[PDB]
């Protein structure tokens, strides 16, 4: 027998599991539409070059790469943001701004799971914190659409500019991104050893509010005015109970320059539900002649499902279909087919019993596939221009009155 299990660290999605995934994705799609984002996509396969950032990122360290037969260094994408930037840079001057683009790519890694799907939402060409406001609200919106509340989850919000200022007011301005990557890992003894290759860092990470950080850098330091505006806008949109300040949040990615944020469950049981931030320099580093402000987030398909399961928000939903058409016997098949065509022509989902079987087993089959209605096509009714209809969740009906 063949190996029936999927390849290492990858998931199968038979119909039952696929209905769950599709329930999650319907939300990602519907939230994007609500928020005016436009869908895009790009090859899962990208040049390895794309991801050579040299900051010790976990995401790049764990890159699922290989060499083609032609000798080209390639990778299954570990994230989407670099692909987005390539696309943006490819368009350059022709792309109208601002742009709001989303996608739900499968992303990969090698080392546990080797794949996941990740909802990506990004705003391009918006300088102001309104971009981050909308992104954080979109993530809250999706979580709320899935049945969660602000009692279940929150979004922690910070700015890297603060640490930047503390890095700046202290000793280069060359390695702010590596430091973030290390500080993101916060085993204190281990983290400090990595930073050797500091006290103001730990202190400012532990500062508990905007007022306390305003004391450290001024009531108008770049980062203070943005956060107050951010919290003020989220407040005004009505999702104020969903967001809060947390100075320990920097994220693991090199390219964030400004506001960063992270979704979490309020019980402390799970990893981040989603993660994002402003990355105003990425496209400059890809060789863009003009700086392109950007901001966005990734929202994985696994952590959220665990949370939804824990909260009893992922009930199995069975397959449904409107009609199951049942030939009384094989002589009625042509006529049953004509009825099938009408039902489908009217926008109904409909099966016809494909195999040879007895009526009562056809009815049982109808029940098992979650049919709302069974339509029996029998000789005596057919000559009266009728079928027998029966609701499952039988009285004779004219063919025209079925739809």
Ligand X SMILES: N[C@@H](Cc1c[nH]c[nH+]1)C(=O)O
Ligand Y SMILES: OCc1cccc(Br)n1
Is residue 59 within 8 A of residue 90, CB to CB? The reply is no
Site map (CB under 6 A) of ligand Y, residues 95-134, x = contact: ------------xxx---x-xx------------------
**Cβ closest to a copy of itself, residue 36 vs residue 218:** 36
Given ligand Y, ligand X, a copy of itself, none, residue 116, with its beta carbon under 5 to 8 Å by kind, binds ligand Y
Given ligand X, a copy of itself, ligand Y, none, residue 49, with its beta carbon under 5 to 8 Å by kind, binds a copy of itself
Least Cα distance to 138 among 281, 295, 305, 245 occurs for 295
Site map (CB under 6 A) of ligand X, residues 56-85, x = contact: -----------------------xxx----
Site map (CB under 8 A) of a copy of itself, residues 356-395, x = contact: x-----------xx--------------------------
Least Cα distance to 277 among 243, 250, 239, 240 occurs for 250
Site map (CB under 8 A) of a copy of itself, residues 314-333, x = contact: -----x-x-----------x
Q: Report the residue number whose CB is nearest to ligand X.
A: 296
Q: How far is the CB of 123 from ligand X (least distance, A)?
A: 9
Question: Phi-psi region for residue 335, left (φ > 0), alpha (ψ -120 to 50) or beta?
Answer: alpha
**Cβ closest to a copy of itself, residue 176 vs residue 237:** 237
* Residue 397 CB partners (closer than 8 Å, separation 6+): 386, 387, 388, 389
What one-character DSSP code corresponds to residue 6? P
* Residue 387: strand pairing partners: 397
Site map (CB under 6 A) of ligand X, residues 101-120, x = contact: -------------------x
Was 63 annotated as part of a binding site?
no
Was 80 annotated as part of a binding site?
yes
Measured CA to CA, the distance from residue 161 to residue 259 in angstroms comes to 8
b/e map of 297-308 (b: 16 or more CB within 10 Å)? bbbbbbbbbebb
Given ligand Y, ligand X, a copy of itself, none, residue 275, with its beta carbon under 5 to 8 Å by kind, binds ligand X
What one-character DSSP code corresponds to residue 89? H
Least Cα distance to 246 among 234, 231, 229 occurs for 231
Measured CA to CA, the distance from residue 15 to residue 314 in angstroms comes to 15
Count of CB atoms situated within 10 Å of the CB of 283: 23
Query: Per CB under 8 A, does 127 bind a copy of itself?
Result: yes
Measured CA to CA, the distance from residue 27 to residue 25 in angstroms comes to 5
**Cβ closest to a copy of itself, residue 7 vs residue 170:** 7
Query: Per CB under 6 A, does 59 bind ligand Y?
Result: yes
- How many residues are listed for the chain in this entry? 403
Q: Is 64 helix (H, G, I), strand (E, B) or coil?
A: strand
Is residue 81 within 8 A of residue 296, CB to CB? The reply is yes
Pick out residues in 65-94 that bind ligand Y (CB under 6 A). Answer: 78
Was 256 annotated as part of a binding site?
yes
**Cβ closest to ligand Y, residue 59 vs residue 210:** 59
Query: Per CB under 6 A, does 297 bind ligand Y?
Result: no
Given a copy of itself, ligand X, ligand Y, none, residue 236, with its beta carbon under 5 to 8 Å by kind, binds a copy of itself
Token readout for 281 is 């320099």
**Cβ closest to a copy of itself, residue 192 vs residue 322:** 322
Query: Per CB under 8 A, does 15 bind a copy of itself?
Result: yes
List 154, 258, 263, 298, residue binding ligand X (CB under 6 A):
298
Instruction: Please report, as ranges, the residues that interact with ligand Y according to CB under 6 A.
Output: 59, 78, 107-109, 113, 115-116
């Amino acid at each position: 027998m063949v190996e029936t299990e999927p390849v290492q660290g990858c998931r199968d999605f038979p119909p039952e599991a696929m209905r769950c995934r599709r329930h999650l994705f319907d939300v990602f799609h519907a939230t994007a539409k609500t928020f005016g984002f436009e869908e895009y996509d790009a090859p899962v396969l990208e040049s390895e070059e794309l991801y050579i950032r040299k900051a010790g990122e976990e995401i790049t360290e764990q890159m699922f790469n290989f060499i083609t037969k032609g000798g080209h260094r390639v990778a299954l994408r570990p994230e989407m943001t670099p692909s987005l930037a390539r696309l943006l840079l490819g368009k350059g001057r022709s792309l109208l701004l601002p742009a709001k683009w989303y996608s739900i790519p499968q992303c990969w890694r090698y080392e546990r799971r080797r794949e996941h799907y990740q909802w990506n939402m990004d705003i391009v060409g918006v300088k102001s914190v309104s971009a981050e406001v909308e992104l954080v609200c979109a993530a809250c919106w999706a979580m709320r659409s899935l049945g969660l509340s602000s009692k279940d989850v929150g979004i922690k919000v910070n700015s890297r500019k603060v640490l930047q200022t503390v890095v700046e007011q202290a000793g280069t301005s060359d390695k702010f991104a590596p430091v973030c990557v290390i500080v993101d890992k916060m085993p204190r003894e281990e983290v400090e050893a990595q930073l050797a290759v500091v006290d103001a860092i730990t202190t400012t990470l532990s500062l508990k509010s905007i007022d306390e950080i305003a004391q450290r850098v001024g009531e108008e330091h770049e980062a203070v005015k943005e956060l107050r505006q951010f919290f003020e806008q989220v407040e005004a949109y009505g999702y104020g109970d969903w967001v809060l300040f947390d100075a320990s949040v920097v994220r693991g990615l090199a390219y964030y320059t400004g506001i960063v944020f992270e979704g979490f469950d309020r019980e402390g049981k799970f990893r981040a539900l989603c993660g994002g931030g402003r990355y105003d320099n990425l496209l400059t580093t890809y060789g863009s002649p003009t700086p392109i402000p950007c901001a966005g987030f990734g929202f994985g398909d696994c952590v959220i499902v665990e949370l939804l399961q824990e909260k009893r928000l992922l009930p199995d939903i069975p397959h449904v279909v409107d009609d199951v058409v049942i030939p009384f016997d094989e002589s009625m098949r042509p006529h049953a087919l004509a009825v099938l065509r009408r039902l489908r022509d009217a926008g109904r989902s409909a099966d016809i019993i494909l195999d040879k079987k007895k009526v009562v087993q056809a009815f049982n089959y109808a029940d098992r596939v979650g049919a709302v209605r069974a339509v029996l096509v029998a000789p005596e009714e057919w000559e009266r221009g009728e079928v027998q209809v029966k609701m499952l969740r039988g009285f004779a009906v004219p063919l025209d009155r079925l739809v």
